[PDB]
Design the sequence.
């Protein structure tokens, strides 16, 4: 990128543990020391200080005055960077980029880079109390940046050096208000802005002095961004002297406007579009949170095939890779900070939360997929206080100071009083409800929504979490709460899918959660270490039957799915064979004999007298078919039921 | 794949020779120490004991109970594997996968793997008497396999741990009878089966207990497999515990039925499809048999262009890569064991042949291209025995016990009595005939076939070997047996191609051989160390005129080939210019003047009066043209005739 | 390629300087020690002796007789190759391939290779007096070549070992006159020639004795080569023995014929096609001339988008990568030797130019893009002598002995007398003019051309250099010579582009230059170390407004460009907004308000009264649009004018 050089420093590390809990080991980044114990259900996970260290050569610039920066893409939870013995920087918060100018700590030839990382609790730390593992370490990798003396800003909250506000115009075009930030500007430097259309062709440009960089650029005939058509432009910014580019940065951006109203729900680009989707944690089976770029895009593609149009990226800042995948595949994204569960008093905990929100907005400001900033999750679990409420006003004020182009949101714990000072702080609001799993009946969800909506017709209500555990080796002919069966989780989501389709004024609903994820503290349903409320398993391999409920309710590609394939052995004179489809007519066959034809909306239930022995079940929708094999048995195996 | 990990161990080996024939060398697998002396004509090839050794790091499973296996893809001919000095396993037979569980012999960190390979004869060994170099060493590569304690079986005759039997159903679907094999099954483990269509979409599924894994899965509207349309399905098997896959394995398979009848020949999926093809050895110029996956696919592609629809994979188990290429590209494959030439009596020789066949079947059961198991080649060269006959009955019974879905076959040496105990053992039978090369006249082939067919109307007769040496620096105007010319080899195959077209009741015919191959004992026709009966040279570069004979008879894409280009200088008032085409009318031009137009079936002979000096011969078929240059000389060069 | 094995030796080098100007450094090829100081404007560049040194392993051939060559792709400007301390060869000339047979200097295992390179002047050296940096070192890389004892010639002038002369025939075909050159030919070796068509299919073949290889091969229905449709054939040659390829070389070639007449200009394949294009140097920003293959193709792609159909590759032999890029992308290439500015008298200098010319023709004879051999550039700067004129006639004779199929050309310095001995030597002739930049006025160019053509109606007149410096931080409301402004360089090329469009009898015009390039001696217009006459900056990143003039005049894809975006702040009651387009009607809008509509040929000038503040200038052509932002100011910045 012009004279800017980015060198990956992911290889060649030794991880030591000063308190001796593990022998030294050589590792490659991305890395966490909790990749296994953070989700194997041993009972705990190692929280402590791990020291990473490696050697690097000092990068060299052709021209005098070069500068060297180390870029950590995340250090969970607390970090100190040393070059050749001397502290270069410290950082708190384990989900955001931070950088350090290590120019003057560098010598020619080999240098030593030392990063102390701690995932231990501290008086100012968030997260501290949550239902998910705090994987320690350098789980996103580390970069070396070489730039000339004049270069776009690398020092401001790990930001990109450029902010872009695209807006549609009445005449069918778009304005891109752009500002970039130059370290050591000077009258001999300009900033040349160029905008490239989705196909790579330049469509607009403008030029500014390097010390006065704000400009608004107009693109005619703009291709708007939406979840269905995520059209992207590329803003390129070049720091120029004479006929030479010194620095170059760029940003993918999208043009969209959007509204949420209490009676109307969500609209984007003037079209009513109810947000129906999922939440997603950042871990994977025995990798901890140390995911590759392929991991992130694979998650995104699975969620796209589901037919979701929104993703709540709880409970922290995610990878640039996953925001990139959202911009490109088209999802409405809710991004949030880990201000979770239990308010911690003090100036330092207040400073942590504000800094983390400042980094979340500045590092992710250019992503068109991000529509909502979330300021807390379930913060009343630890009890309300005046101090806690003031922090939420401070955070609301910061989001509108930093970014008035986006809506603020909040996720309430289930028992949050439906009046009180926690409402009307943010532009929109959501509740985390588990009626039918942690308490109550499934049939309570609908009336709860209707009642709150009627009593608060000025609040935009969404559901930021709802869900139910499903452990796919348990299977019940009489599925009920706390049997943990795949069938009961499907019944829960059968109701909710239809509940949210009945209520477009719910601006967004988010299944908790897309995937099973790791929580060291969990033990229930015969499994340790896990939240198993996923529509898909933690290794991304197995779609539960709940997944196909949503696929039939959301996806447009024709599909037909026979539920209960893992209920392989069925006892009884008849058994219910359930089919999900986005077609409206399903014919079921059993060993070639027609069982029946039904016309229904999404869910189809057939009573089937299985033949003795093995049975081919074939469901014929319109252009799609499905087929599974079931076995009639006298008594179903002991292993289909929790001990 | 789930928690299964396969690591390539092809790098960083040291090859030593205990008896001192060579200095120690560092090698990379695939490797044979006979890559040069096995085909360079020096006189002999080194048969001895080579010792390979390298270090490897112990792989780590995230959960407790991890197991480690070493996988040797092939070791020619006899091997002993040691880990840290201790013997892990021994294996006899040089063409098939074997594995050892080395868990208890591994320590943390670096381990030492040592493999002692011998290609010397033993009282047990097959091959022992054949016309091809027994290249020695680790010529397919080595893998390391990490698996959890519960995993698909790794210990059974080097197999994949799954067997899949697809059959077409009457209503246009397919049943897949699947059985998988689990080491340490358990009530908490299930096997989840999934079937993907050629385009990667799931079309059917079933689930089973891990100690009772057999299931039949029906796929509607199945896409059938044939040599013209090799549609493949993927069967995936996952070992599942709760919401987590422990192990995963998979098999590409095709849906086809087929028949051979003595009068009707070969049918596949209901259509009479005479099998007309070639054999193929597994070596390549100065590589020995240490071929890469690209080499195998290159061979497959060259055979596909030839228009061949069957490949005889003589005389041993070939690479998985090549069976994969036959499944993907579509060839009817005859697969066989090296039970060749001279029968060795003794219980140990018996065990060898029985186990090599068992490995052949279990390691290749899932390939749809394999249609025929061949139990022996030319086994009466060493005289018939009652032990010999009984071993053939044992192999026939073994083949039908392990795999009733395929047909057995045998290749008789030319002088085998057409009556007697070697007939009616296998389902179909072939002969190796060389009338017109090893004696006899070309014109006896046709009558011989018709006499056998007329006398043994209950036998399905094929021709597994026929061919003729062709060395392309020798050229003759009066081509005759033993001048070794390219022209005589073409005349031989001109006749044979037409003979097999006339006889659809020959179930299969295989040219010996597709490529020149290495045999260290050969010395004839002015060349040492080669069998030069190939249609294509041993470096895969030059197609002989014999190749284009078969292309014209077999290939569907229009082509046209002027023969005799390497007969560059022609003497005589007229010279014959021969053209091969799969179009039916050829106009020949000589320096732009029209020489003749003919309508013929495949073969076109023109008598041409060449102008003095150089002549442009252009042949014009319907939509294609060919062009070569010839020179008119007074005396042809001495270098065109064997000395 | 058969038994030929090409190994790159670009890694693992140490570079020392005997005279101690620098410390020892390890380097990778391609490399030059003048990568930075040759274009940073410090004042000078290091011309000394650098000694590169690495160790390599002797390659092994499977048969006795193996040979080892070292191939240096270029060494600027003088080199000596040693293997294990023994001189293998010496070379003069910094831009052509040279090889050494090092078979006998080699021992088994590790050997040491030393290459002393010096870029200082010598009595025989060209280049010596020129406006570009003589970057020193191994700026194209080094190869090791292993061949059998019989192989295609590696010892004749760095040549490819084969020459191919394709010519179209009247019946729509093509003849390929082929000669290859075999070292240690022999009666058992034949050369087998094959011609593959653009799509990889063999269309023609011939075979020859290896002591007598010349042959003409006819291809029917030939696909012609042209700049618009650069169809390429592949000629393949194989050294064959028995059934085994010993060596293999190949060449990509194209079929074209072309003419130049004084009154008709240039024609290719019978269609008049004026050559309008650019020159190109081989350096890039702080890379010196150590360019990668991507750098070469990137330059070619940029020139293709510009719409040029001709590239003058001054002032030396360029890399094979770029000649390939011109063969593949389609440009008429003028290639030349660095016989520039000042004639050196004496026999060694004369030998230098004759040998460098010979290397140019032999190494590039097969490239269909090359149409013109250039013998000298501006050679009368140092005065005419009898000996200069003689050396020019020697070069003409050498060109027509080596290559009668191409046209010779020459580049005259501006003041070269329009009569006399420097004219009518070569087939065509060019002048380097800079009327309007080094003197005179822009409007003199047109009349000059018309006077020469009137006076010399038998000379084919081209313009091999013209241009004007443009430094893009300088902007002027009254552009004039020596303000160095982007606007004035644009005015220049606006006139010149229309000048050559008006004169199709100019056979070729070449803009000096396509890119800015490095000249250590230069210091002017506020920039040091640079010739800044490029249409595009030296880092390939920024197209000057001059670039879009030529794009409008040459390119076919619709485009529209508002000039002067870097004149970003504009003073005056009105400002001129200039637009370039290859559409003929442009509507300009200022902040949504129409300013005017014009129908012009390529260049559009609008007088705009800007609004106070920021202004959106949008230009609407037929199917394309352009948009830029301008600011109205009272006083334009100080930094738009040279101090
Ligand atoms: C999205 C966004 C990105 C920003 N990036 C930068 C930046 O990279 N560099 C910078 O100096 N200021 C940046 N700013 C602006 C600063 O917030 C503000 O102008 C001023 O520097 C106050 O800095 P403070 O937050 O340290 O008080 C950015 C502002 C926003 C909203
Ligand atoms: C194609 C094929 C693959 C087989 N793979 C296995 C296997 O992986 N593990 C196993 O225990 N049996 C496997 N079997 C079946 C065995 O033959 C079976 O265990 C048999 O009853 C035991 O006989 P044996 O142990 O003497 O071979 C396979 C059978 C076939 C036909
Ligand atoms: C394009 C071209 C390539 C040539 N390549 C070779 C070659 O590789 N080897 C060779 O012996 N001659 C080659 N020649 C021809 C030589 O000029 C020829 O051998 C000549 O008689 C040698 O003369 P010399 O030894 O005085 O240079 C080539 C000629 C041309 C025009």
Sequence:
């Amino acid at each position: 990128n012009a004279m800017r050089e980015i060198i990956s420093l992911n290889e060649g590390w030794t991880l030591r543990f000063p308190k001796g809990e593990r022998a030294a080991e050589t590792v490659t980044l991305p890395h966490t020391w909790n990749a296994v114990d953070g989700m194997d259900g041993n009972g705990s996970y190692l929280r402590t200080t791990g020291v990473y260290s490696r050697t690097f050569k000092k990068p060299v610039q052709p021209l005098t005055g070069g500068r060297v920066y180390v870029e950590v893409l995340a250090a969970a939870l607390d970090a100190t960077v040393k070059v050749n013995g001397t502290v270069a920087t410290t950082h708190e918060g384990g989900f955001s980029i931070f950088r350090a100018d290590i120019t003057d700590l560098c010598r020619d030839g080999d240098n030593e880079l030392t990063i102390e990382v701690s995932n231990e609790d501290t008086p100012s730390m968030y997260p501290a109390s949550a239902d998910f593992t705090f994987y320690g370490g350098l789980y996103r990798g580390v970069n070396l940046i070489s730039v000339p003396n004049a270069h776009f800003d690398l020092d401001y909250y790990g930001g990109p050096g450029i902010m872009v506000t695209p807006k549609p115009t009445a005449d069918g075009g778009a304005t891109f208000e752009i500002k970039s930030f130059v370290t050591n500007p000077d009258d001999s430097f300009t900033v040349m802005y160029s905008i490239e259309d989705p196909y790579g062709c330049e469509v607009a440009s403008a030029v500014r002095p390097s010390d006065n960089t704000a400009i608004s650029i107009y693109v005619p005939d703009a291709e708007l961004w939406s979840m269905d058509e995520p059209n992207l432009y590329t803003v390129v910014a070049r720091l120029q002297r004479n006929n030479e580019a010194f620095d170059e940065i760029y940003a993918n951006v999208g043009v969209r406007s959007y509204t949420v109203t209490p009676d109307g729900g969500f609209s984007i680009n003037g079209e009513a579009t109810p947000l129906r989707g999922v939440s997603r944690h950042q871990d994977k089976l025995y990798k901890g949170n140390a995911l590759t770029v392929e991991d992130h895009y694979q998650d995104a593609q699975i969620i796209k095939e589901l037919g979701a149009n929104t993703i709540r990226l709880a409970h922290y800042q995610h990878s640039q890779d996953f925001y990139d995948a959202c911009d490109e595949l088209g999802f409405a994204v809710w991004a949030e900070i880990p201000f979770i569960s239990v308010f911690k008093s003090g100036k330092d905990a207040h400073t942590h939360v504000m800094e983390e929100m400042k980094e979340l907005i500045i590092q992710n400001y250019n992503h068109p997929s991000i529509l909502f900033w979330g300021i807390s999750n379930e913060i009343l679990i630890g009890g309300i206080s005046q101090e806690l409420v003031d922090t939420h006003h401070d955070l609301q004020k910061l989001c509108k100071e930093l970014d008035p182009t986006r809506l603020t949101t909040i996720a309430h714990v289930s028992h949050t009083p439906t009046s009180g000072p926690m409402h009307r702080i943010t532009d929109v609001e959501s509740y985390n409800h588990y009626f039918g799993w942690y308490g109550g009946k499934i049939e309570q969800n609908g009336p709860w929504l209707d009642k709150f909506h009627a009593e608060n017709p000025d609040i935009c209500l969404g559901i930021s979490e709802y869900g139910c555990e499903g452990i796919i080796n348990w299977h019940s002919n009489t599925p009920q709460c706390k049997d943990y069966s795949e069938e009961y989780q499907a019944l829960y989501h059968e109701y909710m899918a239809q509940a949210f389709e009945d209520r477009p004024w719910i601006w967004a609903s988010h299944v908790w959660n897309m995937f099973d994820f790791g929580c060291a503290a969990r033990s229930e349903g015969g499994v340790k270490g896990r939240n198993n409320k996923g529509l898909v398993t933690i290794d991304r391999k197995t779609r539960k039957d709940s997944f196909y409920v949503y696929q039939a309710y959301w996806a447009k590609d024709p599909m037909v799915h026979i539920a209960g394939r893992r209920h392989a052995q069925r006892a009884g004179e008849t058994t219910e064979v359930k089919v999900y489809s986005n077609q409206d007519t399903v014919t079921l066959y059993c060993n070639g004999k027609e069982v029946g034809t039904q016309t229904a909306h999404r869910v189809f239930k057939f009573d089937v007298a299985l033949d003795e022995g093995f049975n081919v079940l074939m469901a014929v929708a319109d252009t799609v078919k499905d087929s599974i094999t079931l076995e009639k048995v006298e008594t179903e195996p002991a292993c289909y039921t929790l001990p």
In short: DSSP finds seven helices and 40 strands in chain A. The pocket of flavin mononucleotide (ligand 3) is lined by residues C 153, 156, 159, 161, 163, 181, 362, 365, 402 (CB under 6 Å). Chain A touches chain B through 34 residues (CB under 8 Å). The first strand of chain A starts at residue 5 and ends at 8.
